[model samples]
Target: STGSATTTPIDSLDDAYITPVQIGTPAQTLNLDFDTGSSDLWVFSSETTASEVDGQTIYTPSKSTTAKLLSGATWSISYGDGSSSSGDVYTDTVSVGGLTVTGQAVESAKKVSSSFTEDSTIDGLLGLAFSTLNTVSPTQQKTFFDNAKASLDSPVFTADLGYHAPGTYNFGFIDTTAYTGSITYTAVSTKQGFWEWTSTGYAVGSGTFKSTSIDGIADTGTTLLYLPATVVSAYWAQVSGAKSSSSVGGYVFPCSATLPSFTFGVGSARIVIPGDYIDFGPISTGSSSCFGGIQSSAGIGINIFGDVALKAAFVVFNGATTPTLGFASK
Candidate 1:
């Protein structure tokens, strides 16, 4: 069976996206970040340290009769940004939209980093990456997608992200009305447990496309798009008064500067990110300088096509025998 859910941005800057998820018998609804970058369905819960609990919702397994502790199982995960969380594991009935999965491994956070505690907009993260990336020890667990794929009409899911607007996540089927134009399919390399693919090339606004292969991962958890230093430099160079500021961290430009759109090739298709999307809000409160959504990946070690890039088009995660990614203009 198929299911659909609405994902909304946490703030005006679209720093992150969150979707409502139902867990346990009575259905405790929590807003979770559907992250395609990691593989663990972890949540802030009653087991979390009291000091780490802020205003975020907590998942109380005791309240659900269907919750069963996965004794001796534990998990700990650290993100690229240095934020981390660790917890005990439990199996419960989890549901997203109208789709339901019984005995889904639900991690109950016992400890969380300060960054996670401060962010009340999201209660947890629902990882969508390959299960090989799951941090659970003693026994590796399948992700929600992997467990639910067999029962789905088709082993695929779609992410339709939006800019300052609510988007959609569809499981088991693609919504034809959600996008325009034919989808362009590309091979995905799951070796690193990410939706990694190679883009044909990229182009600055009105510029010629560069016929270079840029390998990157499609990460919805990340806030910005990270490309090679050379490519990032080319895009920012087109904007007047733009500079790579170490103090502010990454590229920043004058608020009044005219920004140019960015285009990336997905097979034969070209997905263009609007200029407005690149202006990632002011660097500081009421500052005249603004940060860029696209930054250099030199320090990141790997190029990341984060929300800034994914929001430009509809993305499909096809979980066939030979996994592939599909991109369509919206």
Candidate 2:
């Protein structure tokens, strides 16, 4: 059966380690890439290094009474990029928006590989990306939902990323204003943590993809569409300030004096892009400094369409049966 709102199935993980907001009050409130391939919300303990975490901010569980620890638990994770981080298990209070939960299971790393150990700005990653793989060990099931599902926004919460532009990854959910009708929902098993699906295709121009069927994954950890050279090349050729700069990576151009509008295909629906997201972060000063959407890829195991795209819609991964993705706007 088809889904309610069909789109590319990317890993919309609010990840456990890297993305959580360190709100004031000396609090370390974090959100795991709850939908990433793996499942876990780990962070640097009091033993973490200051210099190692050059750009990353650290938080103490003591900020919220809801944060707790687990006495005896074993946890480990290795990434596709050949990085690994591991340590004992602990539970603490974690809150997203107004939702708070006690006994939140989080990982405290004893050892992280050089890839993760250097400039430990990120405490750890919360694997929220929907995947068929489960890094948690046998029995306990060990997903973020396995431990802290109770206090979450929903038994199955949605990470409505608001990144509709290009530069910076602006992610936030202000409201769920589209819950009015008898909505159709699919179900999937949260064996790994979230759910996973295959994409049909992707598009780059606004309304240009009225009913296009693009193939790719909707990832939260990654920052761009990560499409093939063919798609990337074609996109740059279309931009207004489109220039040719060899120093910068291929598929890059100067930000349009008046940036053009763009959108991408997600199944049958089109994810429109906002100018803020399109003309911001990763600013290139080469020749015609520009923002990028389509990027070069070495290979494609998972084509992550990270926050740059998700923020424009409300996404729900029905982790009950069919593993369908639902989308709406705030």
Candidate 3:
């Protein structure tokens, strides 16, 4: 089976991407964030605390005839950004785009962080990470992708994240016309429960390419690109009025600064991020200083090639027996 879906950015800054999903027998539609960094297909539902709910839509599993509680099963997950969610589990028929999966574990959130509650653009999160990262207790449940992979034409999925536009996600096959040039394949390490791979160095703008190995994960859930402090500092050095700000808690520069583009190597291929994409936005409304989309990953422990970088290319998450990652310019 094959499926395709449209992912739309939540805000002008592209804080997160959301896709519509169908749950239950009668099909309750909800917009959910397709997070690649974690593994828990959780939703804001009737089970969620009423006080914690804001303008978000709630999934009422009790109304779905196909919904069945996974007795004694519970799940709790914490993200790198410090946001968290936890709740009971239920098996229900879930559909993404037109791809349907029966008995999919649907985590009904009983509790969610304040940050998630404040973000009304997303009703929940559909995790696309490996199944091993699933947080359900007692008997761990499989992710939506994991449950559907076997019946798919090909055990793979692709992400085409846009800069300031809507993108596409395709499952079971690669859309050949979505990208340019040949897809470059790279070895992936699923040991960390992430789509981790090694990047071959980087360069600032049109400068010479530096040869070094940087390990990072392709995390669609994250909002920015995080690299080593050395690489981050090097990029900012080219900006006329860039500096690390304590108040902003990251690198910032004059709004009028002519930012340089960044390039990183994936095997023999080079993917370049436009300078415009690097200027995330003004630190504050009407502020003269702008926050950078690329930041130091020193505090994060591991580097993350988030939406800022992923949006520049077409990425494939191959789930073959010997898994690999494919990247191509779009």
Candidate 4:
């Protein structure tokens, strides 16, 4: 396992992009991530061809007088299904809402086909998820975070996935506004974020659960919830006649209607998985029924609690205080 949580692939929001300030100037609005796996800041360029772009939104470089393209540095990121795309590197002056950072790190996709490009209006994806997997390198290594980190009050940022629900989307700033409610903070072990943690078992309502105590990580890169069979079946009964085979190392419920609401403890706080994920992700089996949100994992030691569960909770990654996991409300 990689030891940190990865991000799930999001639908990428096209209407969400905004320029907060001029590249070098400070004191203003802010930018948001169209990210699912990463938590870094980036922008779109005037260079992107409208024909090749899909999903989410796009940003025009006209706002920045200092925007520049990084040539010779190419990038390609892929999804879990092996859906892939590639692009060239470029830089530009950009804003996020009102907060402005000059020469922000961004990618200009030369080629982005596959599922990610089919159903969207914009091109490219922004990664504001985590630093563990940043694509920065000698040529393309400086991300918006790595670049602006030297000036930000805090080198790290936190997010609140409480807005769109399963949760909201909080970027760059904390909802000190939301801090009015009960909150909990736990120090994250370095190993937890990279590896995906599947529920050992689950219990709903007033029932007891086996995973009352365990390390968990939230991933935006993956789309579905990855939990053990006991945790999957106990929610309801969607998994039956399921054997751990190479086809899908994880659990698969033979019946679509048999899914359960589940929760795993985050320190003393319990985060619930919305039932809709089960219904939306069901796969038709050998004809008699459809399997719920179960898939094969190649027994990969990683356990990423993707957006299927995250969208339902408000998650905070506190980089200011290393090894911290804080939770707040919308």
Model 4 misplacement above 4 A: 1-33, 39-64, 146-156, 162-167, 176-181, 189-206, 212-216, 236-259, 281-300, 328-330
The predictions' CA RMSDs to the true structure, in order, are 0.6, 7.3, 0.7, 6.8
lDDT of each: 0.95, 0.49, 0.94, 0.47
Each candidate's TM vs. the true structure? 0.99, 0.66, 0.99, 0.68
lDDT of 4 by residue, 81-186 (tens): 5665555555665443333445666565555555544645333455544455555444545455445555655444554343232233333555566444655666
Clashes of each: 0, 62, 0, 68
TM-score of structure candidate 4: 0.68
Which window of 10 residues has the lowest lDDT sum in candidate 2?
1-10
In lDDT terms, how accurate is model 4? 0.47
Tens-place lDDT digits, model 3, residues 114-181: 99999998999998989899999989988888999998999999999999999998889999999999
Task: Judge candidate 3 against the unseen true structure and give its global Cα lDDT, from 0 to 1.
Answer: 0.94
10 residues in a row with least lDDT, candidate 4: 1-10
Task: List the candidate 3 regions with Cα displacement exceeding 4 Å.
Answer: none
